[PDB]
Amino acid sequence: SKDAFTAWNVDRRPIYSRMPKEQVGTSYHDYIATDWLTAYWDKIFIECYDKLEDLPRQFDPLQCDEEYLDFLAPLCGWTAPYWSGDYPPESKRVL
Amino acid sequence: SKDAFTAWNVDRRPIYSRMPKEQVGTSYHDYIATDWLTAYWDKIFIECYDKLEDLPRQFDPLQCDEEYLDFLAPLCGWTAPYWSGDYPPESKRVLLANSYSLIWRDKGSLTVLSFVLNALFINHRIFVPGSFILGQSQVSEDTLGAAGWEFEILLPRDYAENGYEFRLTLKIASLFSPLWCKYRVRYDNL
Amino acid sequence: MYVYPPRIINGTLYKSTDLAEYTRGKILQTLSIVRGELVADPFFGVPLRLFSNINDYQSDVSKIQIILEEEITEAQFIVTGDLKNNGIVSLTVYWAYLGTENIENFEIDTSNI
Amino acid sequence: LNAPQLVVDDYEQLIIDSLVHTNVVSNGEFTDLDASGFMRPFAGTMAYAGSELLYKANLASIAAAKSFFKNVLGVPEDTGTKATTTLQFGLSASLSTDFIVPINFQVSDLSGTLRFYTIGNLVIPAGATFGTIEAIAEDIGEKYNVSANFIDQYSTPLTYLQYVTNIRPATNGRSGETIDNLIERCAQIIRIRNPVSALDFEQLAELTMGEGSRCKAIGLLGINKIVTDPQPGVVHLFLLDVNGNPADPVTISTVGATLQPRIMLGTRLLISPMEVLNIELELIALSDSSKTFQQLADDILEALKVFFNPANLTPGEPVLIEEVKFAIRSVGGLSISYLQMNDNAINIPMPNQWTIPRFSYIGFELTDSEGTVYRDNVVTVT
């Protein structure tokens, strides 16, 4: 029952770090299998966490990645001939 | 309340062995009449038990007894045109044992036809007509060739012309040779 | 099923087909979790009182007995408490698996890991 | 019809009915139905023995069905298979004599729970530093199926023996079989069929050859491959290997060794390599600027790789320029203006029935509304 900050940012094990530890000797943290089995899920959760953290950046055309320029085009009002997919990525950012 | 093993296999008296005996002096087992009256029913039950024990053997065409061959024939797909009561029981065993594994699986093949013919104790040779025969044809001038959809069943001279073996092999060829193929039963000239 | 203690044996999780050792693993899991340890169920677990004088030292024994009775219905539990010399309170949980009628030995115990 | 029931629904009813019969037979003179009566212990003992007999009869009928499955059908009933592995014993020296590992040598894993025993005597010859033998598990069940190198502990040392391991993972360990699995396994035997048409003849060959390969079956086509000279009872097979090339003699022989026991009487099976006709493409198309030039080139290349995949091509059929145009246009971001196949803008007929197309070269000439021209030449040969 620990806080989110520790589990996601310090431990970076949002699942394993929440497994009970109090009864030393016979507890989830006392057996390494518990650490091994949940490692992939913690890795996936942290990857998605970093993606979500960078998400607000991805809606800034100057700072976003080229994968989002075509996604942000209709948001800015570019659908008809005004927009082209052969445009230079930098020109897309500026427009 | 005896365990079935003792009553059926050790005592072989499934009814009499279960009769009261604890109170000696006067018990069913203390009077010979109880033994006498239940003797026939114990014998009948033991006979039926032995028949049931032997029953799984009776579904194996090789080892089973001849009364079950006609019973097992429909289970292997043999009926009136293919099956026959006149077939020797050894041939019946061989045919039933290899119905699913060889005969119906590969019906129409040379191996299946020859196997069926050998099961009925018909010595034979399957010969595909051709311009080159390994026995006698000469290398310098004889030519290679084949017949296509033609073959022949050659039988030793021991069998009589249009006798039992000739007409039996005609029936077997009709039942197992491919319908579009032309075949003839002839005397082996070798 | 996977018994409680996660051990990688022969390259895989220890999967058992005998329900007696699975029940024993359930007992170990229940006793190894303190109430509040789990985020999904913060009420599951034994209540722990460690630093206090030994006057009402049977109340927690009764509570643990009740919790074991409610959680694990496949076994019968009797919990006894004894007072040791320095500060040790010795709990003894007597459990029997109702599926079997005799004590069942497990071959994973003699195996050394 | 319906399956008869072998067991009696209620045996107490049977005892009761035998006692009603004691009354019926004696014409209403035997009216004692309680356990203190003379007839009741006899009738009850008979009923109990009969219940045992009928239970055995049910078991016997089930076993008879299973015996029919095993002997006639050829399908054994799986009541549990002990897992087997391949142990390797590695010696610490090159002995001048033969090293004999006796039968039933016990090895185990680290936990000691799993125990395997060698099925035979291992005879490592003189001058040999290792030898392999098959071992079987101590008991049935899936728990004995372990990966390699987990079965290495042996409690009984032998001189000059350095290591014992299992190179193979232990497999084939099962605890039993449900009736449905046995029934489907029995029914699969009845469904076994030999190829009789062109299609299943091709499928049998392609299964042996492997995924990515093709076959074509032509009737009455002789060895000389002359269409106007039909040869009775002949099935020519033309094979394109797993890599898209015409089949090499090893492939021809391994397909023949598989299909020879499957032809019926009066049929001649001929196997020959297939033929390939190279398709060279030149393309002039107008982009709509919805994609980059490189993306368009890659997408068209992949679409044409799929279109000319051997599995998607029927040998002996003409390559329609309309179909190639449609395959390219299905990418979406372009509009075809000119397409030339082998220096022509017409369909390409095949010389014979056993030639499959294979495209080897494409010339991209793409243009946008801005007039920018992207030129490329891709050679797709392996």
Least Cα distance to D158 among D105, D197, D96 occurs for D105
3-class DSSP state of C83: strand
> Buried (b) or exposed (e) across D234-269, using 16+ Cβ within 10 A?
bbbbbbbbbebebbeeebbeebeeebeebbbbbbbb
Strand partners, C90: C82
Least Cα distance to B82 among B177, B178, B172 occurs for B172
- The C-alpha of C100 sits at a distance from chain D's nearest C-alpha, in angstroms, of 22
Which residues lie below 8 Å from residue A33, measured CB to CB, with a gap of 6+? Answer: C6, C7, C8, C13
3-class DSSP state of C69: helix
Tokens of B41: 């029913």
Which residues lie below 8 Å from residue D325, measured CB to CB, with a gap of 6+? Answer: D336, D339
Strand partners, D53: none
Task: Please tell me which of the candidates A20, A21, A33 has its beta carbon nearest to residue C6.
Answer: A33
CA dihedral B18, B23, B26, B30 (to 10 degrees): 50
- The C-alpha of C101 sits at a distance from chain A's nearest C-alpha, in angstroms, of 28
Tokens of D380: 């797709």
Q: In terms of CA atoms, which chain D residue is nearest residue A88?
A: D292
Q: What type of residue is D358?
A: R
Experimental approach was cryo-EM
Q: Across the interface, do C8 and A21 touch by the CB < 8 Å criterion?
A: no
Strand partners, C13: C8
Task: Please tell me which of the candidates A1, A27, A28 has its beta carbon nearest to residue C39.
Answer: A1
Q: In terms of CA atoms, which chain D residue is nearest residue A89?
A: D292
CA dihedral C39, C44, C45, C51 (to 10 degrees): 70
Tokens of B96: 């039933």
Q: How far apart are CA D182 and CA A16, in angstroms?
A: 44
* Helices B110-119 and B89-97: angle between axes, nearest 10 degrees: 150
Q: Are strands D355-367 and D275-287 parallel, antiparallel or unpaired?
A: parallel
Least Cα distance to D132 among D144, D150, D118, D152 occurs for D118
Q: How far apart are CA B158 and CA B148, in angstroms?
A: 30
Q: How far apart are CA D60 and CA B54, in angstroms?
A: 9
Q: What type of residue is A61?
A: P
Q: Across the interface, do A22 and C7 touch by the CB < 8 Å criterion?
A: no
> Quick one: residue C101, left, alpha or beta (phi over 0 = left, psi -120 to 50 = alpha)?
alpha
From residue D229, how far is each of B131, D225, D354 by CA, in Å? 18, 8, 16
CA angle D368, D373, D378 (to 5 degrees): 115
CA pseudo-torsion sign B139, B143, B149, B151: negative
Q: Which chain C residues contact residue A3 at CB under 8 A?
A: none
Q: What type of residue is D342?
A: N
Q: How many CB pairs under 8 A join B and D?
A: 118
- Resolution of the experimentally solved model in angstroms: 3.4
CB D140 within 8 A of CB D81: yes
Per-residue DSSP letter, D374: E
Q: What type of residue is D46?
A: M
From residue D238, how far is each of D51, D205, D358 by CA, in Å? 66, 10, 16
> Buried (b) or exposed (e) across D114-124, using 16+ Cβ within 10 A?
bbbebeeebeb
Q: How far apart are CA B125 and CA B32, in angstroms?
A: 71
Q: Across the interface, do A37 and C6 touch by the CB < 8 Å criterion?
A: yes
CA pseudo-torsion sign D13, D19, D21, D24: negative
Q: How far apart are CA D79 and CA D62, in angstroms?
A: 14
Report the Cα D248 to chain-centroid distance in Å. 25
The H-or-E segment that residue C93 falls in is: strand C89-97
CB D269 within 8 A of CB D223: no
CB C94 within 8 A of CB C103: no
Least Cα distance to D86 among D36, D45, D120, D43 occurs for D120
Q: Which chain C residues contact residue D147 at CB under 8 A?
A: 10-11
For the range C26-30, what are the long-range contacts, defined as Cβ-Cβ under 8 Å and sequence gap of 24 or more? Answer: C26/C71, C26/C72, C27/C68, C27/C72, C27/C75, C27/C93, C27/C95, C28/A26, C28/C4, C29/C4, C30/C67, C30/C68, C30/C71, C30/C72
CB B82 within 8 A of CB B92: no
Least Cα distance to C9 among C106, C110, C108, C104 occurs for C108
3-class DSSP state of B24: coil
CB D299 within 8 A of CB D333: yes
Least Cα distance to D179 among D57, D56, D75, D53 occurs for D75
CB A17 within 8 A of CB A7: yes
Q: In terms of CA atoms, which chain C residue is nearest residue A31?
A: C6
Residue D157 C-beta-side C-alpha neighbours within 13 Å:
4
Burial degree of C94 (CB within 10 A; 0-12, 13-18, 19+)? exposed
CB B153 within 8 A of CB B185: yes
Residue carrying structure tokens 């010859």 = D125
**What's phi and psi for A29, nearest 5 deg?**
-75, -15
CB D47 within 8 A of CB D11: yes
3-class DSSP state of D324: helix
